């Protein structure tokens, strides 16, 4: 062969759109749980 | 396989945030003396909402 | 047995637990076990943040429970060791009436309605301002003055 | 005949039905017939959630109707077997004052306005907490203590 220069950051067809669609993370639900945690702390956490 | 692993740890952290959210459903309303909060439970509805 | 409810551990009083409204209440910091085995087998929930332990009261004991109110007018109230002064947003007691071990005493009004549970106190010489856990418009609130000791 | 009207079924006394406003109220679990033959033939509406059977009062029974109010202050009230405590959102009676068969008796205030009908009760030791349906701000609502059985 003569085209051998390839590695692991190798662009392709639909593949990277597929790994985009798979990466629907949880950080929104984590953020709303952090919101509940914050609203519990701030009932009496005005100092520290 | 480790991609499936990291996605299942993301589901595990979803479980952790959900169980912390159910514990912070419980800690405002243990079973307060009043034992009647429609203004809490009628909007939250996380789990076992039926106790007034 | 008029208002007295108690958790005891290995012969010594480790404070008190009280069933109030629809809740079984126990300070979380009191170590040990409720000294009634029928009680000891229920599902208890612990909160370290507020130092609260809660359980659902069984039906067949409901008629011994204390009435309650969220409303605390200024004045004098009652607890196990006598009168309790409330004024200025401040609960106070004569110095020496309370010590480590006394956590859990209810405060009740002239009609016997419990309004607060004693958590501890801060001795300031002649008087002692008590640190308290209480409830108001169905929300649990802990009030702690600086330099308060756990009871 | 003050506030209570007999329901009987196949020789055995089977609870009570009540004339209130322009309404006939009867617990749904009560089988049998109201002891007025004109009454027994009306169109009855069932509500399973509230255990209620309802009928239109005929015009000619003007003098048997009660008076009512939605307003229930805390305190003590009256029924046929004695005092009924209302406090904490709860109706209670001395244990043994009520039994299977007593379902259908109304609860009324000191001014004789019917405010509630008994559906059943939960024994809590010294007193028994009643399961009842009643109208708060003119809307029907069921108040049920945990573990209540029909009487």
Swiss-Prot record, chain A:
It is found in: Virion membrane; Host cell membrane. It comes from Chikungunya virus (strain 37997). This is Spike glycoprotein E1. N-glycosylated. The chain holds residues 1201 to 1248 of 1248 of the full protein. Residues 46-48 are cytoplasmic. A lipid is attached at residue 42 (S-stearoyl cysteine). The chain crosses the membrane at residues 25-45. It is a single-pass type I membrane protein. Class II viral fusion protein. Fusion activity is inactive as long as E1 is bound to E2 in mature virion. After virus attachment to target cell via host MXRA8 and endocytosis, acidification of the endosome induce dissociation of E1/E2 heterodimer and concomitant trimerization of the E1 subunits. This E1 trimer is fusion active, and promotes release of viral nucleocapsid in cytoplasm after endosome and viral membrane fusion. Efficient fusion requires the presence of cholesterol and sphingolipid in the target membrane. Interacts with spike glycoprotein E2. The precursor of protein E3/E2 and E1 form a heterodimer shortly after synthesis. Processing of the precursor of protein E3/E2 into E2 and E3 results in a heterodimer of the spike glycoproteins E2 and E1. Spike at virion surface are constituted of three E2-E1 heterodimers. After target cell attachment and endocytosis, E1 change conformation to form homotrimers. Interacts with 6K protein. Interacts with host MXRA8; this interaction mediates virus entry. The interaction involves 2 adjacent E2-E1 heterodimers. A lipid is attached at residue 42 (S-palmitoyl cysteine).
UniProtKB/Swiss-Prot annotation, chain B:
Residues 20-24 are annotated as: Interaction with the capsid protein. Coiled coil: none annotated. It is a single-pass type I membrane protein. This is Spike glycoprotein E2. Palmitoylated via thioester bonds. These palmitoylations may induce disruption of the C-terminus transmembrane. This would result in the reorientation of E2 C-terminus from lumenal to cytoplasmic side. N-glycosylated. Interacts with spike glycoprotein E1. Processing of the precursor of protein E3/E2 into E2 and E3 results in a heterodimer of the spike glycoproteins E2 and E1. Spike at virion surface are constituted of a trimer of E2-E1 heterodimers. Interacts with 6K protein. Interacts with host MXRA8; this interaction mediates virus entry. The interaction involves 2 adjacent E2-E1 heterodimers. A lipid is attached at residues 25, 45-46 (S-palmitoyl cysteine). Residues 25-45 are annotated as: Transient transmembrane before p62-6K protein processing.
